[PDB]
Design an enzyme around this catalytic site. Structure first.
Site, PDB file in Angstrom:
ATOM      1  NE  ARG A 129      -3.786   5.203   0.575  1.00 46.08           N
ATOM      2  CZ  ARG A 129      -3.751   5.161  -0.893  1.00 46.08           C
ATOM      3  NH1 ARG A 129      -3.881   6.198  -1.693  1.00 46.08           N
ATOM      4  NH2 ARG A 129      -3.633   3.944  -1.332  1.00 46.08           N
ATOM      5  CG  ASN A 130      -0.333   4.396   4.030  1.00 43.28           C
ATOM      6  OD1 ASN A 130      -0.712   4.586   4.856  1.00 43.28           O
ATOM      7  ND2 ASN A 130      -0.776   3.595   2.767  1.00 43.28           N
TER       8      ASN A 130
ATOM      9  CG  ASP B 139      -1.925   0.981   0.976  1.00 46.35           C
ATOM     10  OD1 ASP B 139      -2.243   1.598  -0.151  1.00 46.35           O
ATOM     11  OD2 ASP B 139      -2.702   1.433   1.898  1.00 46.35           O
TER      12      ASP B 139
ATOM     13  CG  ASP C  22       0.207  -0.131   5.734  1.00 39.69           C
ATOM     14  OD1 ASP C  22      -1.080   0.577   5.559  1.00 39.69           O
ATOM     15  OD2 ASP C  22       0.380  -1.180   5.216  1.00 39.69           O
TER      16      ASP C  22
HETATM   17  C1  LIG Z   1      -0.419   5.881  15.934  1.00 37.22           C
HETATM   18  C2  LIG Z   1       0.883   5.361  16.073  1.00 37.22           C
HETATM   19  C3  LIG Z   1       1.384   4.903  17.066  1.00 37.22           C
HETATM   20  C4  LIG Z   1       1.389   4.462  14.683  1.00 37.22           C
HETATM   21  C5  LIG Z   1       1.190   3.249  14.670  1.00 37.22           C
HETATM   22  C6  LIG Z   1       1.536   2.408  13.431  1.00 37.22           C
HETATM   23  C7  LIG Z   1       1.813   2.912  12.338  1.00 37.22           C
HETATM   24  C8  LIG Z   1       2.280   2.060  11.030  1.00 37.22           C
HETATM   25  O1  LIG Z   1       2.723   2.510  10.240  1.00 37.22           O
HETATM   26  N1  LIG Z   1       2.272   0.788  11.366  1.00 37.22           N
HETATM   27  C9  LIG Z   1       2.622  -0.242  10.276  1.00 37.22           C
HETATM   28  C10 LIG Z   1       2.000  -1.457  10.173  1.00 37.22           C
HETATM   29  C11 LIG Z   1       2.307  -2.417   8.966  1.00 37.22           C
HETATM   30  C12 LIG Z   1       1.572  -3.738   9.013  1.00 37.22           C
HETATM   31  N2  LIG Z   1       0.356  -3.713   8.747  1.00 37.22           N
HETATM   32  C13 LIG Z   1      -0.168  -2.693   7.755  1.00 37.22           C
HETATM   33  C14 LIG Z   1      -1.678  -2.761   7.807  1.00 37.22           C
HETATM   34  N3  LIG Z   1      -2.429  -3.570   8.466  1.00 37.22           N
HETATM   35  C15 LIG Z   1      -3.476  -3.042   8.813  1.00 37.22           C
HETATM   36  C16 LIG Z   1      -1.808  -4.356   9.492  1.00 37.22           C
HETATM   37  C17 LIG Z   1      -0.506  -3.826   9.749  1.00 37.22           C
HETATM   38  C18 LIG Z   1       3.519  -1.981   8.382  1.00 37.22           C
HETATM   39  C19 LIG Z   1       3.959  -0.723   8.173  1.00 37.22           C
HETATM   40  C20 LIG Z   1       5.134  -0.492   7.614  1.00 37.22           C
HETATM   41  F1  LIG Z   1       4.714   0.283   6.388  1.00 37.22           F
HETATM   42  F2  LIG Z   1       6.006   0.308   8.204  1.00 37.22           F
HETATM   43  F3  LIG Z   1       5.798  -1.334   6.744  1.00 37.22           F
HETATM   44  C21 LIG Z   1       3.545   0.226   9.317  1.00 37.22           C
HETATM   45  C22 LIG Z   1       2.189   4.262  12.422  1.00 37.22           C
HETATM   46  C23 LIG Z   1       1.904   5.077  13.399  1.00 37.22           C
HETATM   47  C24 LIG Z   1       2.190   6.629  13.383  1.00 37.22           C
HETATM   48  C25 LIG Z   1       2.408   7.739  13.169  1.00 37.22           C
HETATM   49  C26 LIG Z   1       2.475   9.342  13.238  1.00 37.22           C
HETATM   50  C27 LIG Z   1       3.879   9.996  13.202  1.00 37.22           C
HETATM   51  N4  LIG Z   1       3.885  11.058  13.244  1.00 37.22           N
HETATM   52  C28 LIG Z   1       2.488  11.423  12.772  1.00 37.22           C
HETATM   53  C29 LIG Z   1       1.896  12.526  12.494  1.00 37.22           C
HETATM   54  N5  LIG Z   1       0.302  12.686  12.117  1.00 37.22           N
HETATM   55  C30 LIG Z   1      -0.198  11.472  12.247  1.00 37.22           C
HETATM   56  C31 LIG Z   1       0.440  10.358  12.626  1.00 37.22           C
HETATM   57  N6  LIG Z   1       1.654  10.272  12.794  1.00 37.22           N
END
Ligand SMILES: CC(C)c1ccc(C(=O)Nc2cc(CN3CCN(C)CC3)cc(C(F)(F)F)c2)cc1C#Cc1cnc2cnccn12
Ligand SMILES: CC(C)c1ccc(C(=O)Nc2cc(CN3CCN(C)CC3)cc(C(F)(F)F)c2)cc1C#Cc1cnc2cnccn12
Lengths: 300, 285
Positions: free
Chosen positions: A158-159, A154, A172
């Protein structure tokens, strides 16, 4: 990963960033975090972190998905990927903690800017070398994911998150945002797909690979040079986008591509087109995309 | 899907020369055979056009392929099996609405060619009916204006979108990035500032388009203001300090009709009327 919770007592609440069905997201400060996390610390002030707090009466299903997300995130350690800094799971409520990117997601960041005009030299502006620097960081992060055999599935602006000095980190957010509902097409039950960023083989066969991530990168780069002013294939319906994937399969000259963005040099549009090669093996690897864009950013 | 037979398009005259092709007015040799005279407009891509031009051609086909309404230009067929590529639409004999109204004067029975005020309302009602069709398809036009409306026989109106392929209306567009230009005088304030194009902004453009019709296309919106002043005016809508200016009431326009235009130019997009309501007002009330 060690089974030691992040100390809740070191999270000073600053602001509620969002609220949802199964919990809230808070912005927090952590003083002198060197004893808790290992990072390339940004420039004696507290470290900003984002905290997703699972609701205390969350269902077993929600907890299971929460735990699985932690597991996926725990293996990702790169300057252009979001970083899981810690978790609180030994008691309720369940918490996960990432680094904070002050400028939000890349779509809303670029939507607030305009491309600087050199033959016109009053909202904020961004240069073309800086747009190339942003794209190069995205390719760098995707390059790192490719070395882990990790398929994002994805990738889109937006990600991507924006920090200080135009630092980009790939994230994500799933389907936790009503803002981007139009970017996803419902296929089965609750499952939705970002068809406009997906390669033809993903849409028709469900083949998600690093090479399909390269296709999504082409669309993401297209977004960046469009400064996120328009959805890919915006005047085409989802069904028509799905038809278009069948024309890539048919391969009789009826498939269509995203047009060259205004002011986009032909060489960069050619890079996008290679990302959209019918054959996945003809699409450039992220290491080549990173090298191209990092040099192009410095020679512009 | 079978192509349109090229040989049946008999050439009459060239309607325009383009950078990547030509537009021809054609007669279909035997229209009764293909029904399963009859004039058609035909855009011919150059047999030497770039792949980019060819790609943009096929995408226009795709967009137009799903437009079926009495007040929307209709794609009749395509010739894409060979070079040169051709797309075929129905022909409107009276050109675009801007040229149509500019050639007319308002009828005054109490005193060139003329057009009544009820006919002007009938024209505007047809435009609102077509835009209601586009809204049901979640299709945002983004360039609604009389220059993109075509006039056939019996004052029938069909909405089209000619892009920027005509030097005639260059003054109606403001360049923002590369070849990208915007019709700011028809654009809602949120479009000029944030680029938010919705059906509600199409309603704003309808207000300006309705202003055009009641002016009989004699004046560009805010004609004595520069593009920069129009953009500044968008900022004043945002500030909402009472310094935003509006298009004046056209001469001999009832205050009720002008009140409708003002409602189309509400600062809040959610407060602007939907096209179904604009159509029934202009056609009945
Ligand atoms: C709210 C905070 C604590 C937060 C939590 C999680 C994530 C994130 O990305 N988890 C991710 C998950 C996954 C695997 N699956 C993807 C989707 N599936 C449904 C199940 C799982 C892969 C990957 C990647 F892509 F890395 F492989 C990343 C991001 C955040 C954040 C933030 C943030 C930082 N700064 C700002 C400013 N404004 C708003 C938000 N912010
Ligand atoms: C010359 C003939 C063959 C012709 C071709 C096309 C069209 C037309 O409008 N395509 C259209 C495209 C689009 C999306 N685009 C794609 C992207 N792009 C950047 C902008 C818009 C939207 C829409 C609308 F608005 F429907 F959504 C209509 C019109 C004609 C014609 C004609 C004609 C008929 N009668 C006369 C008399 N004199 C001169 C010309 N005539």
């Amino acid at each position: 990963m060690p089974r030691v919770d992040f100390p809740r007592s070191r999270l000073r609440f600053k602001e509620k960033l969002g609220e949802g069905q199964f919990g809230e997201v808070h912005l927090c400060e952590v003083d002198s975090p060197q004893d808790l996390v290992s990072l390339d610390f940004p420039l004696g002030h507290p470290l900003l972190v984002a905290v997703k707090i699972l609701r205390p009466d969350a269902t077993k299903n929600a907890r299971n998905d929460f735990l699985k997300e932690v597991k996926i995130m725990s293996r990702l350690k790169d300057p252009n990927i979001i970083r899981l800094l810690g978790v609180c799971v030994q008691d309720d409520p369940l918490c996960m903690i990432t680094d904070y990117m002050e400028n939000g997601d890349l779509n809303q960041f670029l939507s607030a800017h305009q491309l600087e005009d050199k033959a016109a030299e009053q909202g904020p502006t961004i240069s073309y070398p800086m747009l190339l620097h942003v794209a190069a960081q995205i390719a760098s992060g995707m390059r790192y994911l490719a070395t882990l055999n990790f398929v994002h599935r994805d990738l889109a602006t937006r990600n991507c998150l924006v920090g200080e000095n135009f630092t980009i980190k790939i994230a994500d957010f799933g389907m936790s945002r009503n803002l981007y509902a139009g970017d996803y097409y419902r296929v089965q039950g609750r499952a939705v797909l970002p068809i406009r960023w997906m390669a033809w083989e993903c849409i028709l066969m469900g083949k998600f690979t690093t090479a399909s991530d390269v296709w999504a990168f082409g669309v993401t780069l297209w977004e960046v040079l469009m400064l996120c002013r328009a959805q890919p294939f915006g005047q085409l319906t989802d069904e028509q986008v799905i038809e278009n994937a069948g024309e890539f399969f048919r391969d009789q000259g009826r498939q269509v591509y995203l047009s060259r963005p205004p002011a986009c040099p032909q060489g960069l549009y050619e890079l996008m087109l290679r990302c959209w090669s019918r054959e996945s093996e003809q699409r450039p690897p992220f290491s080549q995309l990173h090298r191209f864009l990092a040099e192009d950013a410095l020679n512009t």
